[PDB]
Amino acid sequence: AEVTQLSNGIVVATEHNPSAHTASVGVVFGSGAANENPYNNGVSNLWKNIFLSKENSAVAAKEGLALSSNISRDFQSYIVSSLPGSTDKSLDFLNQSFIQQKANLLSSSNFEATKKSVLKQVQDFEENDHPNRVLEHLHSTAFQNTPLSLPTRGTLESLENLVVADLESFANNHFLNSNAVVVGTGNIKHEDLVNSIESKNLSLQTGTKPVLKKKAAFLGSEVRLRDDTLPKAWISLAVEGEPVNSPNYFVAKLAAQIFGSYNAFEPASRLQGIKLLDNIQEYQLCDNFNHFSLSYKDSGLWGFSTATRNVTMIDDLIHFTLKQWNRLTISVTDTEVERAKSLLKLQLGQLYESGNPVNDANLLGAEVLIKGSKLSLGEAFKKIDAITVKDVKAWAGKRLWDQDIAIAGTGQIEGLLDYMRIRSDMSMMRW
Amino acid sequence: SFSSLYKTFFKRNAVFVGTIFAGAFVFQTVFDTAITSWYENHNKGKLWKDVKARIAA
């Protein structure tokens, strides 16, 4: 169960795991929905859907093998699951239908059907869903005029102005050989190490990825969509996280576990926890938490999110969460750090060791492109056992003391005071 | 040199209040003496200070 890298034209990384028996070859691209300017937003989505429709229709009738994909910010994650002993067919299909040719798939009728399906899907996502809506709005507001804030799906206005030529140009400017790993997560050992190097298994347009000019930034802003028709509320605070490949990633993740998740409709969640959960339960202040610390190569975000049925006590929820964040950098009980360490160990163990090979393939590709070499979870355990209260205190004092916050919540938000009793209260306590 | 050192100097609210009070004290003293000096030398021969010296013989 050891990961092996190399560099022979295309980086090939394998993580044998004899436990599961669903071999899943894959392809991962390091430039997704961030390295592209806002005027052509949904090109990655169009690629994703043309794949997932026509190639999914073809594969099963040809052989037996599913297929999936993903995109977060810079991840043309692109996976072809299979049986343990049919990976050569998977690579043959992947060669013959994804990198070449790109003309038989991009037919007019097929492209237009994909276009209308994507339009319908983005439309009803904008209508029905809500937490993901406010999350995308949070990203957009935190990175204004930065190639990081445009959504993964896109905007209908941007979608409507795409036919072929721009999709072809993106294909020729980001499907290179410089940044295209070939993941082999599953129960394959070395066939992936050799078959990936053949006569022509090499991406078209060898060259480099065109680097964007501006890097990133941060500045606080609101994109609220205040509308009283919807029943509940939604908020999403944020403070600038830690970028991947920094010696603060894991301590930030720990700071994103002391408070932890919550769900006020469970007998096993309303009762445990920390001081804020004791202080909230007296009334029905809130209805959900979600603490997270997202990180990307450009920069990272330390998240927060609720969905509160109560609409009049929003300010009290906000004030209590802010006081907890304020005092996280003044005094933390050592037992709190210990419990956070144990819980976070559990969370990473669950995430990295899911029985589904696709998620492991995704994460292996992510790390191998960004870090350059996978960091085994064992080293994660050893390097997290040494996180002491001094380190968390220092990191919190650096990242959470009078800092810009981005908030963008839909629903009924009129009870939320606008910006000064939501920011200048974030250090008011006499430290 | 407005680096993180001043932000760390302003991080603690209590030292902020201590510094503002000490500044108030020193400001009160120096401002008062400066204002008195300017008001005084602005009037040569007017104020009693030099009048009593002149009448002294």
């Binding site: 995308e136 005029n145 500045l219 994109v223 | -």
Partner: peptide, 24 residues
């Protein structure tokens, strides 16, 4: 103009610096 398309704030943004010095 979609919802995500923020208006041009560069007429007032402090694009230069944008560090802790402003807070100070």
């Amino acid at each position: 103009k979609s919802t995500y398309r923020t208006p041009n704030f560069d007429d007032v943004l402090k694009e230069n610096n944008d560090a802790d010095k402003g807070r100070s």
